[PDB]
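DM between two lab members

TW: hey, do you still have the drp4 entry open?
JB: yeah, one sec
JB: this one, 38 aa:
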Amino acid sequence: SCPPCHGRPTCTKPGDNATPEKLAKYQACWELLTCPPC
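TW: and the structure you got?
JB:
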């Protein structure tokens, strides 16, 4: 469930400029901070 860090989206934006599922990316990405990348 950890994202590959060889060319990943940074998705650091909190979804302020986002409203639809477009923010779901960032939301999920933010939760992925629980898993440490390379």
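TW: got it. The helical segments are 24-31. The longest helix spans residues 24-31.
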